[PDB]
Amino acid sequence: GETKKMICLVDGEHYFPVVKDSIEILDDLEHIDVVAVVFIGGTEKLQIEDPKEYSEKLGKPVFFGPDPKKIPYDVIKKCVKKYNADIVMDLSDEPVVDYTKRFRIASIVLKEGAVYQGADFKFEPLTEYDVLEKPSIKIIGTGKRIGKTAVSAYAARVIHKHKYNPCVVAMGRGGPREPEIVEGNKIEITAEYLLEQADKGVHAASDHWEDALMSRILTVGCRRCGGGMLGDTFITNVKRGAEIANKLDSDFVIMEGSGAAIPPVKTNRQIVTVGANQPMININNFFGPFRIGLADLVIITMCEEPMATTEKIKKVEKFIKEINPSANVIPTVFRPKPVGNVEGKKVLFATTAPKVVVGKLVNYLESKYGCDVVGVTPHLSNRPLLRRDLKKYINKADLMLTELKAAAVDVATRVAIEAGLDVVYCDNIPVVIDESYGNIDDAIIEVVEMAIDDFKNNR
């Protein structure tokens, strides 16, 4: 039993006595103390004229914005810090706040580690365990199949080229209760080895297995359930994974998220992935802006037709620069890279990609690697339709080129090995669309250097 420190957000669209009654009712609760009050706008009542008049009558310190027509975001942030608030309680309404303004206020309050709540809603700030004994980056994103894993694999290779030994702790959508370690820095991960793991009941197409193969690195397979609006998760073993990663042979750590969910482990720096294919409201409203606000570097992905228009790409770029002008921003597209040789082969291509981009990926594969793609399955995520596509194409291909994602091991690899084909795993590589935005390796190196410098200087 200890009191929670509450800041009240109030407005001049309410008459002061009903506000005073509300603050006295909140303060007179057991386990709550109202420590400050912020007037967030409105002027219908100005009979009480002076912040010191309001403060005298409340017996609480009272804060106002420089402009009564605008939400005093900076004053709310400064007040939550100054009074070290546990809770910010919203006693406002239209016209002073709409949903957009509430999510803007929420994004500030939750970042300072305070609860944001009102009459009918509550938001919990992200728990964040300070457990890593190595310099580190978080790789998070706004959704699924936007390239969090693809960017993470690439970043690991860049960090290796920079003469560091990276470990990826991947927060996946399942896995053993004790996090599993994959020594992709020591072990030759083949199709037959992945099937041997799948036969033991191991989730061999998970991101830790993919990053181990695609980037030849040590990885730790963690699990989670649920992924909230702000990005928190219901249960996870990622804290245990970060503890494991400390003890193993590595000298840089990537904490990689899943879906819109954020690993609850403190890192020196953060890379945020944003698919230009996603609705603008998911990027510029709700807790999109909160996620973009965490970034040192933003990778915008899917920056091409048919996935996004030029105007959409420019709108996403413009918004990111407005809300996070400190962040470096790189717009990108994904292109395939086989982890093996496919030159002059008849190729069956297996992917999770949208059907509208398969033609472009095939055109690229044939033009660059000199293969002939005899058939495609975009159904790695759908086991019945996958088997249908395999029976159609399997006989006319020399080898199957597959993403190491979804049913790629226990269905597609199994069928291809029993049919006597070679199986080559396929990475997705982030390629910069526009050289005016500079080089993606240099952008990652900048963030890696910041993470190392931060770790050396802060204890």
Next chain:
Amino acid sequence: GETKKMICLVDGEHYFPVVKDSIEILDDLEHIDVVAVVFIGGTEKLQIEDPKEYSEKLGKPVFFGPDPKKIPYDVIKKCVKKYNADIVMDLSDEPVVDYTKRFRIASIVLKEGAVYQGADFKFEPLTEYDVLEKPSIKIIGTGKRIGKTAVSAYAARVIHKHKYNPCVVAMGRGGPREPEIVEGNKIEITAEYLLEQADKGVHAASDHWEDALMSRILTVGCRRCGGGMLGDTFITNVKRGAEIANKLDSDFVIMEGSGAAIPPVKTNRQIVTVGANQPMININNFFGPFRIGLADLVIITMCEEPMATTEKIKKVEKFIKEINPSANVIPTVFRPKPVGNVEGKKVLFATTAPKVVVGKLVNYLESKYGCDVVGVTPHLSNRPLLRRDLKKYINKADLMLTELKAAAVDVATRVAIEAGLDVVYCDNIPVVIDESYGNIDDAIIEVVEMAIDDFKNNR
């Protein structure tokens, strides 16, 4: 302390064992029982071949949609009803749910009186006291200055013409702890009477005062603080206002809201006001669709340039009919009606209306009532600029025509009475833009008849 019945929302983007662990963790909590699970979509992490395995392995009943690509909204609603669930717990994430899908799920769950919550968020359903002993309508809206009061005054007069005696309980953002009673059916409310009230410290420009004067009815002045996202309020005396309304001389009750807030008293039927001037996201996302879903009749307001484009008005109409197909929908604009005679007089017009629409209101006043508008103040909300306009124009006018809103009594009426002018109070009348949408009085009568029929039969 009593056990709360929880339904879990789960997906096939999580591997079964981490979902099972999550459900066992939730069920093993004190005063929570997991009673059912709804599988809301996704496929790739289903190694389970038969959906019956899922329920067998959880030891919980599990319900599925007909289409694994779509959220089974209907199944969620049917299960919350069937189990009389207190909580719905979201153990999903991107790609299966985005923010929009979560607000669609929230709107269903909260309407059935269940909490909706996830990893980092919680939403509380509306408190609703069952206290009225008379047939009744709630008049609520999506914002401020969208015409809730204007529609409410009109509805009261329509109910009077239909041979009933209506009472308006107005939930404002201010007023005495004991609700204030105004007998506008028995008292001739003059400018001098309103100044006598303002000098006693009464909020004479409040909605209960306005409805009393504009509609010559009994009204009860209630107060509240805060207005949440769903529309709940932190504190209010509206329960006491409804108890007062039962005792007094009336045979129909209108419970009128304020801002986006909803009076927490049960009513037979609901009228929802939606300003077409508001951003589409506030109408078609968050808890706009929840508010529109409460409606028997939706009044769309501000349906003209400069406030809304024809395309906007059509988008609002189309959306409302999609989410609430049995609701009657009437698109409208507001025009002045003096509560007195202004024919051939020199008029100083005082309003809270935007500068961009004053010309249309003036053009209407002069064309309909044959007055000469010698000047306008759009500054009833801004006491300094109001006095500047009054000093300029007061000498030119025979009478001041004013909305009974904001500084209309304690500044504008006071200056006009001391300057020896007549003061005429001005209603805002909802006018239907297109006769193909039918007559607004008939639309109100339909809802009033439903409220009377419901009241007679639900006893």
